[PDB]
Amino acid sequence: AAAAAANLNAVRETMDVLLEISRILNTGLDMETLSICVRLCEQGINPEALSSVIKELRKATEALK
Template identity: 70%
Template sequence: MEDPKIQEAREAMDILYEISTLLNTGLDRETLSLCLNLCENGVNPEALANFEEKVLQ
């Protein structure tokens, strides 16, 4: 049986990925997960978005 916290985290990532897909961000699950981890660790989300925009061009 999977730990409830792990299951909740997986479900949250599934929802976040679905939103990302609907918004046509072009981010895969791994990249989205990395971005989420960076934001959770204090990286400015706007700065991260600007960086990704420039890298993906």
């Protein structure tokens, strides 16, 4: 398939758009993890729950520093 891979290039293009959005906002997230978050909202999820998850997980790496 050829059109099914140009859509994957399209996914990477929006992923770089969200890369610029992540740096101007100063988030710690990288590209692989945001693709995991994209799949999470494919199944449907509260962003308020994902932010509480990540707002526990990042400042539970500051408790073993």
